[PDB]
Design a protein around this ligand. Structure first.
Ligand SMILES: [Ca+2]
Length: 185
């Protein structure tokens, strides 16, 4: 990987740490939030709103304090990915919110282009109403997804290994991202 540990409060838009797909996607608020906006076409990428990291990141703790958009059809996401990206394996780890029901969160991952690891977890709260912290601890032999510090799911087989960029996307209305943190453990 090219990137070490960082904390992103989203007070300013750091172009050294992030890049916008389109200047339009993708606006900062006065309350220290990054905002994604979808207007209006499917199916991304890259026909939806999206932000991505400049550097690539590997094993460690990824935390995102966000609020998905609440509307049928749309998907708000936080994920690492190699892209793809031809000449590189498709490795990706996902936190996704289906707008039709923001009381659920979907976990997933891809390794060498093979996903189909969708795990839908009931949150016990509407994710759109307040900020909650969603995380995954990515290590070579396990991914552990957390919601507000509590373990919600564990994957132990076919774990991705290729460092990827950190993405935020809204596709298929606003998704808000309060802060992000990567800890190279
Ligand atoms: Ca913030």
């Amino acid at each position: 990987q090219t990137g070490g540990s960082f904390y992103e409060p989203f007070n300013n838009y750091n172009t050294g740490l992030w890049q916008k797909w389109a200047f339009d996607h993708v606006s900062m608020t006065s309350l220290g939030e990054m905002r994604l906006s979808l207007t209006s076409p499917s199916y991304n990428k890259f026909d939806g709103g999206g932000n991505q990291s400049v550097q690539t990141y590997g094993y460690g703790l990824y935390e995102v304090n966000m609020k998905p958009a609440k509307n049928v059809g749309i998907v708000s996401a936080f994920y690492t990915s190699t892209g793809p990206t031809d000449g590189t394996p498709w490795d990706e780890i996902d936190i996704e919110f289906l707008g039709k029901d923001t009381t659920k969160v979907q976990f997933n991952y891809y390794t060498n282009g093979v996903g189909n690891h969708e795990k839908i977890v009931n949150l016990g709260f509407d994710a759109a109403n307040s900020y909650h912290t969603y995380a995954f601890d990515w290590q070579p032999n396990s991914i552990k997804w957390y919601v507000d510090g509590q373990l919600k799911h564990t994957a132990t087989t076919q774990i991705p290994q290729t460092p990827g960029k950190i993405y935020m996307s809204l596709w298929a209305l606003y998704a808000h991202y309060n802060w992000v943190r990567y800890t190279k453990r």
